């Protein structure tokens, strides 16, 4: 009978055996309230502490998830993890039970104080749940406590009128409240509040970075951050026109009045289902509801905050996957796995126009970008065209921003580590020609290969996948334990790996803007330098110069 | 007693043994007049046939060379072959005996009709002599007749008033006259007038290409062309402001009168040395005296003629050397063999402004070129900077023009072959870090390694140099024999090679604009595709687009 007494009352967890003969069991505390329900007058308001209870509260099953709709095709596939979009039937079972009363977290405890890794999920800020990420294997394997969190999503978590009526960022404030709850109560579970690492993939990674830029993350709250395939600098990390979308939403539900306070009060009267089901489309590659620059939680544009080093110095780990942008080209690839020269020019031109605006003069940007992403040493290959087009989207939305983020963190003294993920397990839902796509590193970080194929992750993981997952978890948990991916657990070959550990002699060197060393995570691992340096510098150095040659405007 | 009766009279040659035990001797006919002396009223006039003689004329020693000055530092080192500029003391001995009466050619005959290879020398159109190129080894080894030619140089060979007073191109007309003489008389020496191949390096290669664009090269005159490191499309292949320089020269010698006919008549009265010794400097990277677009010999801009396929369909072979542009950077390299970021920016910017003119608006060209030639994967390496800067000059002045030439020839049906020369023998006069420079292929084509170091080519040639020279001569002479570098002599290993022939299994595939297959000539030979495709397309496609973004002007 796993009982723990927290500052709010006694809680009962549940022991769970893992589907691996080597891994020990864990104790799970599911559906733990970390804040009061954000309902009634508390909708569109910062989270309040949870109410205490006098008996023993059971935490043996997941609590309802935050309101969302993932079955009507409103989800931006180019932004969400492929494992999620390709397995909607299973994902749906995890979010079938919903409620506005959804501020709960899950704790996985292995059977001195242990490091705590807090996972922040996120695809587009509109959907998901930490419940989708089983932290059992990571906890048991790395001997760390793993926590998954549910924070307010979409409209309920991010609506903002651009003024005092609704300041936005409720979902981020929930994450901060979950971190405060953890800091104050995890010791009761055997956790170390002085060694808290927050990690997340995709929009979850964006959340991680945004938290490091907020003064609400007081010194000492958490110590390290791991942002996988997600930054605060991408076009879809922040909502820059919140008021516009708040009013479009209001108009659709019959609440669009002149006064913003009355508008919000009206929205607070609506059944949450009504707000969630409306179709509010943002510009392509951008978001409608999400983090906003309120001047308080998020003090200014993240780019400015980063350039000016407006963040505490956490230990930082970040990276990207070889082929993040799969969904960007998957639909235009012909039956021969190739992309035509015409589809290529069309795709590149439209992407540039949406991100940089239409030129009011003679174009130079589109012409230059098409030239740069054309393999002149093999310009006739339709498959190579597919590859370079995919690389363009990957470089622009993930690689460039990640490098810009790494450069600034190291420049300002944050111990930084960078990785490029070049491995994955292909399911029957992904093209045979595809490389690791957005979200593909998640199963490895969570140790799914160690417990075999699951409903959520059905790929038939190989022994090499198990070995690689073990390697990744060792680096990730070493980082959680010391802020150094190499300490204290060496990369050795043990029965758990099932195959020789190919990283035995690979020390993950710290990243610096000068050498830019990074870990190439794959079956042929090694530390390399200047990840895709040519394309990264094209986007960060040359393009801005060319962009300023003309006046541009959007629509 | 080597006697031959030509259409103009009997000529006596001289037998010559070669410094190689395997090679047979050759009969040399040196100083054979192929035209009448272009003196008096014949200065600045097309060449006339030579006068016949009734006795036996001796052709056992070189005739005086055409007027020139190579000792006062007026020679543009960036344009001339390195072996020439680095060994002026020896070169000077070959041009010490000069005369305006200089239209003579040299014939090398091996001891059915044999193919004839006519070598056209040329550094900047102002200096040199075919006498510098001993065709003995090529003739003996390949069993072909080799001819070297002396044509009018500099002022005497190319002065033009831009009108009828002096139409220019006298030196080119001399080459045509030498080819006509060869066509009509080489059979008397055992040569085949139906298999005449013209070849040349540097400005000599430019001459070769210009001849293919002239209507004066009537169908049947010659059948094949080999242009080594030289085209008719480079900035220094043609003189575009002839009148301007004709008048600057006239002013310097006291002949600048208003009437162009009177100006020319005055120049015709001057001692040739007076015209040769004047310092007439053209714009950097351009020429003052050289081929001009007269609308007759050269009907229009070579670029236009090439785009429109205005040339007969010859068998063509063309190529470039790995590091042509050595002299462009050699002087700015520090004692550490590197180039600073500042010197790099300065060199690139100045080169671009000279070739493209100064922009009258915000620059885009300089910024883009600097970005393209920066190795972002090793941006801190000063030696890499040296290499990329050298590559920039090489790509622009030699590679791009050669590829443009090859593409057009193949597009219009000319059987085309392309090579990249990646081997050389370093003398103690060139930097240890340098790769094959401009003119470095000459010793190999001429078989110099077979006879050991010479006064002109003092490098201590290795066994591999001998082997490679043998390989090159086989490809070149096979081309002369059949128009196909692979027939009829196979690339086998014989005692003459001294080392195993590394090209035994390397068939030189024909070049096409689609596959752009070329022969990589080096110690690790093989046919490759799309030589430096990225940089070539940058210059041929992207740059022209960026150039048109602004109005540009020169000074
Ligand atoms: C809590 O769980 C216990 C053990 O399964 C059960 O007996 C009880 O009915 C549940 N509800 C509570 C909190 O009493
Ligand atoms: C909501 O009302 C305001 C003021 O009446 C108006 O400006 C706005 O367009 C309306 N919202 C929309 C987009 O329909
Ligand atoms: C030509 O060469 C021959 C043989 O060396 C020599 O006898 C003669 O004097 C030379 N002069 C001429 C033109 O006969
Ligand atoms: C030569 O004379 C002409 C006309 O008298 C003049 O235009 C030209 O500038 C003179 N040549 C030079 C460049 O000195
Ligand atoms: Ni000017």
From Swiss-Prot, chains A, B:
Major subcellular site = membrane
Q: Which GO terms describe its molecular function?
A: cell adhesion molecule binding; identical protein binding; neurexin family protein binding; PDZ domain binding; protein-containing complex binding; scaffold protein binding; signaling receptor activity
Q: How is it modified after translation?
A: The N-terminus is blocked.
Q: What does the tissue specificity note say?
A: Expressed in brain, almost exclusively in neurons, and spinal cord. Detected in pancreas islet beta cells.
Q: Which compartments is it annotated to reside in?
A: Cell membrane; Postsynaptic density; Synaptic cleft; Synaptic cell membrane
Record keywords, A-Z: Biological rhythms, Cell adhesion, Cell membrane, Disulfide bond, Glycoprotein, Membrane, Secreted, Signal, Synapse, Transmembrane, Transmembrane helix
Task: Give disulfide pairs as residue numbers.
Answer: 66-102, 255-266, 425-459
GO-annotated biological processes: AMPA glutamate receptor clustering; AMPA selective glutamate receptor signaling pathway; calcium-dependent cell-cell adhesion via plasma membrane cell adhesion molecules; cell-cell adhesion involved in synapse maturation; cellular response to calcium ion; cytoskeletal matrix organization at active zone; establishment of protein localization; excitatory synapse assembly
**Which segments sit on the Extracellular face?**
1-551
Membrane association type? Single-pass type I membrane protein
Q: Record's Gene Ontology CC terms?
A: cell surface; dendrite; dendritic shaft; dendritic spine; excitatory synapse; external side of plasma membrane; filopodium tip; GABA-ergic synapse
Q: Which domain of life is it from?
A: Eukaryota
Q: What are the glycosylated positions? A: 58, 256, 460
Oligomer and partners: Interacts with neurexins NRXN1, NRXN2 and NRXN3. Interaction with neurexins is mediated by heparan sulfate glycan modification on neurexin. Interacts with NLGN3. Interacts (via its C-terminus) with DLG4/PSD-95 (via PDZ domain 3). Interacts with GOPC. Interacts with AIP1 and PDZRN3.
| Function, as annotated | Cell surface protein involved in cell-cell-interactions via its interactions with neurexin family members. Plays a role in synapse function and synaptic signal transmission, and probably mediates its effects by recruiting and clustering other synaptic proteins. May promote the initial formation of synapses, but is not essential for this. In vitro, triggers the de novo formation of presynaptic structures. May be involved in specification of excitatory synapses. Required to maintain wakefulness quality and normal synchrony of cerebral cortex activity during wakefulness and sleep.
**What is the protein named?**
Neuroligin-1
Instruction: Tell me the gene name.
Output: Nlgn1
Query: What portion of the full-length protein is represented by this chain?
Result: 52 to 638 of 843
């Amino acid at each position: 009978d796993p009982l723990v007494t927290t500052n709010f009352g006694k809680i009962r967890g549940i022991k769970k055996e893992l589907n691996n003969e080597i891994l020990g069991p864990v104790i799970q505390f599911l559906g733990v309230p970390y804040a009061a329900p954000p309902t009634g007058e508390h909708r569109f308001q910062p989270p309040e502490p949870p109410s205490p209870w006098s008996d023993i509260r059971n935490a043996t099953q997941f609590a309802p998830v935050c309101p969302q709709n993932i079955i009507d095709g409103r989800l931006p596939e180019v932004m969400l993890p492929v494992w999620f979009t390709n397995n909607l039937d299973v994902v749906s079972s995890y979010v079938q039970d919903q409620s506005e009363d959804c501020l709960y977290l899950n704790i996985y405890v292995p059977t001195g104080p242990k490091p705590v890794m807090v996972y922040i999920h996120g695809g587009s800020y509109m959907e998901g749940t930490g419940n989708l990420y089983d932290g059992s294997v990571l906890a048991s394997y790395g001997n760390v406590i793993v926590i998954t969190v549910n924070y307010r999503l979409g409209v309920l978590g991010f609506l903002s009128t651009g003024d005092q009526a609704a300041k936005g960022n409720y979902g981020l404030l929930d994450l901060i409240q979950a971190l405060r709850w953890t800091s104050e109560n995890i010791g009761f579970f055997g956790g170390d509040p002085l060694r808290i690492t927050v990690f997340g993939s995709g929009a979850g990674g964006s959340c991680v970075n945004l938290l490091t830029l907020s003064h609400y993350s007081e010194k000492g709250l958490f110590q390290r951050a791991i942002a996988q395939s997600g930054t605060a600098l991408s076009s879809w990390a922040v909502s820059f026109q919140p008021a516009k979308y708040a009013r479009i939403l209001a108009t659709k539900v019959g609440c669009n009045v002149s006064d913003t306070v009355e508008l919000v009060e009206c929205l607070q009267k609506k059944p949450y289902k009504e707000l969630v089901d409306q179709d509010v489309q943002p510009a392509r590659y951008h978001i409608a509801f999400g983090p906003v620059i309120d001047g308080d939680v998020i003090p200014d544009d993240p780019q400015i905050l980063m350039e000016q080093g407006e963040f505490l110095n956490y230990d930082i780990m970040l990276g990207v996957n070889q082929g993040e942008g799969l969904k960007f080209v998957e639909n235009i690839v012909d039956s021969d796995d190739g992309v035509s020269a015409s589809d290529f020019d069309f795709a590149v031109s439209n992407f540039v126009d949406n991100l940089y605006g239409y030129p009011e003069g003679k174009d130079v940007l589109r012409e230059t970008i098409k030239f740069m992403y054309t393999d002149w040493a093999d310009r006739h290959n339709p498959e190579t065209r597919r590859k370079t087009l995919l690389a363009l989207f990957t470089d622009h939305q993930w690689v460039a921003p990640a490098v810009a983020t790494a450069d600034l963190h190291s420049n300002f003294g944050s111990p930084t580590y960078f990785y490029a993920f070049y491995h994955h397990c292909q399911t029957d839902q992904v093209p045979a020609w595809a490389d690791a796509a957005h979200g593909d590193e998640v199963p490895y970080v969570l140790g799914i290969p160690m417990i075999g194929p699951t409903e959520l992750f059905p790929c038939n993981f190989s022994k090499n996948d198990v070995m690689l997952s073990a390697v990744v978890m060792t680096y990730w948990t070493n980082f959680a334990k010391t802020g150094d991916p190499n300490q204290p657990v060496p990369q050795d070959t043990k029965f758990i790996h099932t195959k020789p550990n190919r990283f035995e002699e690979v020390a993950w060197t710290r990243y610096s803007q000068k050498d830019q060393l990074y870990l190439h995570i794959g079956l042929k691992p090694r530390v390399k330098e200047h990840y895709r340096a040519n394309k990264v510098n094209l986007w960060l150095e040359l393009v801005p110069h060319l962009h300023n040659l003309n006046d541009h405007h959007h629509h």
